[PDB]
């Protein structure tokens, strides 16, 4: 009953990009993927995407290639093999209108079914319709035709209802009308709007469903329009989170990707970034500058101005300010990671604290461990990485240098300032540092001394 054609071969010159236009991201997914999601709401039996140059990349729906730019008519014709003969209602939508909703496309197909139209145009009203196709209606307010700006009479220029370039067609007629135009065109290019002209010649019924919101119809041709799309999608996402019980200091300046999940009672300061497959648990606090990519954060956590990537963070964890949790990290329940701390490829057990100026790389760390300020786990020799194992209740002295592969046994202490080259037994202390020597009056000889300035 329902088919979908997505036009993804249109010109992208004004993007000034080596990336095909429809692959440019809005809130973490391509414009094309936003259109795939809205198209999904009509439950189409077949979906055909028409691509052009760099087809391989877009493919890397059913796909067909448009090798030559001969207009939207030729584009739609590239789906003839797959859709010719079939009965039911065929949506034609651009890959560069990512703000059109599933609700809008459901209401388009229903309106078309409703009025037994051969074609239905998705229209919208704007007070500045310059450049757009105008929807011409009669006394009875039925759709007669689409008039382009260049063809518009001064009276027609007054028309505020415009063509969004989104349509539903009776599938059978659509492929019949295109062949007609193609063969009798006396010209190379042809346009999906040419089919509306043919239906006018035959008196076949064409209708228009108007979007309440003109801004939903945005067709992205450049990075100005890309940023407008980002602004609308950001507002849409953040609105949903607020209705679901998430507080935002500033939802106009908080950057949350389309698939991020956020539990009720979360508080988000301005200028928080959440990306990819990120999940935030109940009552967690995210402060200004926090940046989370493809990570799970538990309940009752506080992430202060920190960057967390491809990692798991348990309930009650405190991170920051200015901490970096790098890929394949796990922070256990109630872990504290303080300022200027980097964790990479490491598991950290519950209640463990690394408060300051510390690097934990390729470590397996137990519960109730304390990392002194300035602790470095040394994991790399210039060719290979080595694992360090740290047991429960270990006290790693400030400014210590732990050279993997070593094991620090349960309850051990590393003396502050120590270089550790060998395993430390459970309940031992290890000390690897110079003994302090004091030299009376020697500072009087040195350039910092007041007596020497």
């Amino acid at each position: 009953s329902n088919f979908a054609i997505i036009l993804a071969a249109g010109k992208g010159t004004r993007m000034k990009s080596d990336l095909p236009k429809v692959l440019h991201k809005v809130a973490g997914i391509s414009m094309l993927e936003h259109v795939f999601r809205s198209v999904g709401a009509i439950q189409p039996e077949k979906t055909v995407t028409v691509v052009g140059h760099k087809a391989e990349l877009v493919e890397e729906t059913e796909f067909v290639t448009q090798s030559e730019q001969l207009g939207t008519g030729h584009a739609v014709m590239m789906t003839e093999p797959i859709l010719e003969g079939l009965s039911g209602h065929t949506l034609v939508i651009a890959g560069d209108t990512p703000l059109i909703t599933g609700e809008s496309l459901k209401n388009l197909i229903d309106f078309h079914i409703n009025h037994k139209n051969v074609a239905t145009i998705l229209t919208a009203e704007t007070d500045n319709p310059f450049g757009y196709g105008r929807i011409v209606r009669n006394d009875n307010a039925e759709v007669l035709r689409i008039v382009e700006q260049k063809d518009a009479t001064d009276f027609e220029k007054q028309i505020k209802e415009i063509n969004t370039g989104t349509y539903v067609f009776d599938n059978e007629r659509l492929f019949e009308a295109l062949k007609n135009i193609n063969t009798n065109n006396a010209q190379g290019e042809y346009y999906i709007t040419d089919v509306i002209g043919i239906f006018r010649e035959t008196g076949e019924k064409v209708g228009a469903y108007t979007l309440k919101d003109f801004d939903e119809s945005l067709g992205v041709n450049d990075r100005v329009a890309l940023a407008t799309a980002e602004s609308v999608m950001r507002r849409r996402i953040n609105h949903k989170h607020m209705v679901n019980g998430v507080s935002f200091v500033n939802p106009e300046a908080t950057y949350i990707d389309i698939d991020v999940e956020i539990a009720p009672e979360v508080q988000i300061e301005a200028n928080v970034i959440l990306k990819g497959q990120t999940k935030i648990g109940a009552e967690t606090v995210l402060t200004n500058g926090t940046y989370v990519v493809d990570s799970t954060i538990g309940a009752g956590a506080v992430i202060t101005n920190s960057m967390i990537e491809e990692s798991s963070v348990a309930d009650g964890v405190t991170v920051g300010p200015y901490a970096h949790i790098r890929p394949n990290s796990s922070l256990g329940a109630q872990v504290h990671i303080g300022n200027f701390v980097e964790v990479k490829g490491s598991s950290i057990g519950e209640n463990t604290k690394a408060g300051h100026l510390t690097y934990i790389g390729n470590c397996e760390v137990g519960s109730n461990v304390n990392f002194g300020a300035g602790t470095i786990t040394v994991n790399y020799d210039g060719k290979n990485k080595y694992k360090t194992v740290i047991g429960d209740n270990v006290f790693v002295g400030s400014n210590s240098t732990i050279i993997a592969p070593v094991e620090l046994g349960d309850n051990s202490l590393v003396g502050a300032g120590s270089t550790i080259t060998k395993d430390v037994p459970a309940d031992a202390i290890a000390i690897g540092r110079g003994r302090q020597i004091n030299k009376d009056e020697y500072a009087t000889r040195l350039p910092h001394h007041p007596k020497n300035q």
Copy 2:
């Protein structure tokens, strides 16, 4: 002459919160506290706040409890014991309209006094009055009644003047009208708007004072409206600071709490956060990402992308970028705290420099001290914290580990890379590190060496 009732027991379902609705913060204080401040402008002899569930928490004005949700009429009746019999003008205001100003409530009470009204409604005009109570006026433009959306005739739906749910009543009549409705209601619930209906029955004079600004009347029911309130209050606060001589790169994206004080000639970049009892002195520069909580900052300071909490910062101080001044710190005149430095529970004397990768905790530090990059004050043994005392003109070597409790005497130098376990006399040097040994050609054996890749 003036009384005030604050309705703080209304439903909060759409907030999706375990915190009562009116306690949700806007610019650093509860919505209820914003209403207490606007109510203060009418100098009320008595102020009564009606609370519901979690009453203890809101209490933790005079307070009365509404154990049962029987409507705003029952809410106002919970103040009968305290206000019954008294003469003068009684403001009724919701705890969830935090944008209404003192100026607006002064102009409401004056307008009511003016026209010897028995009731005055605070009204506003909007082009989308759907859902609101409509204010019905006559040829003479006097207020006849309030008509709810569900009762509105199609002609009444056209009315753009709405009820904000803020009122002034002649106190005597108000408690008389409520008893009447309560006893003869033939129903459980009753509404403050029911009193306006009764005055219509008796021909008692009801007037309306219209807000110039409809957006001032916002009643917060969800976190969408909470963020709108934050946006308006942020704009209001930042406007006041700009008129008072504070420059903002972007006042729509700068987050300054309601009671923060900012001297003239301060320059604030976008995305600065100032919270609580914070004070900023003249000509100080705050750069993007700066976050200050409950701190005093002097004149001619430059805070670059740094977090400062419960601390005092003197004139001429430079902090950042990426520094953390933690609670109970004092930075003396012209102190420099550079990148990746944490100061906690420490006093730092004038002209002292800690430029890099340093932790200063539980230290008393003198004037003209230099902390080398990588210096750690070690203050914690896993149970107790210990104090370090550092004298004037001390040179603390890079990458040194100072294990409290020790004293570094005036003009002393700690050798770079030293572990310090013992006091250092004034004018001494202390060195606690291994002597360098060179091994010819040994690097040729190791995995980093080009010859081994």
Copy 3:
């Protein structure tokens, strides 16, 4: 044919500033410099700037001083010596209207030439013209006069076309009309608008060119208007970059100075700051919080939440998060600078890595060097700075302390935790640290041990 007078002596009381008003910056240059750039579009033979108090500072165009505030008429008269007698069209513009474009001033002078006017007023339409001079036209819609608010009839108050205080005059008449007013004034002050009154007395032809955009005419009197000017100029700059192929997550919250150059295909997250003579190469990624001053960044770089000042960054470089590249640094091709790293006054050769918690100051560093986490180059003795030279393929051990002046030879390794006081030959290792000693069961005696809590 074209002359320009810039009025830069007007009152600045509402700025609450010791800096003269026109020197306040918008997007990295003074409001006066924005006006110099728009004035440049008319190719003036002579440009005269009238300054007042702190004249020296504005001077630190031709300049003339207005020692006494006797109005804009007296201001323009201070240019009589330089412009008296000359023929051609004289632009009069304020130093505090920085949003007026070159295109607008070209269209003003052309319109004036066009209609052989003796005067032309730059006008604009607003729905709130309160306080402004009204432009009075006739049936034929010719400009009769300028009427100030205080002189306006109720009919004249309705006029929405306002005086922006920008003009073109026939130079000869202008200086003749001013002398007339000055001598016969019976008063101290006189106004450029008084010249329009005189032309009305003589029937000399006065015309008005209307700005399409009223907001372009903003005259900055306070820091509220300064921030509005910042908002418009930020939008203008960011629009140009987007049309030129730069992606912005949020162009309303990205802070790019007027002369910053940005290659096509650059991606900029929200809350990026680019200042001064900054240049960004093709396909470079700048993430949230990045702050660049007077620096060149190559192609295919990724700057993650980092501050880069007066430095050069080659192609392929990765910086951050939370790195600080300080003045007179150079990062060679494919260099990696990781979290909590500071580079100052240092050259770093290609493919060199400093991933963590490192300070590199006054160093000459070769290619394929590895800095271990926690490495400190010690460059300062409290009086003088010293240079360290590091060769190619050097492996600088984690937590090492390199005390300048030393040279680390090609392919050398410094043992982790080492203090280095002496040169290290090429292909050597250097070790300067305590040997690890383990003490069985000693941790059982210490306060961290579970058995002691």
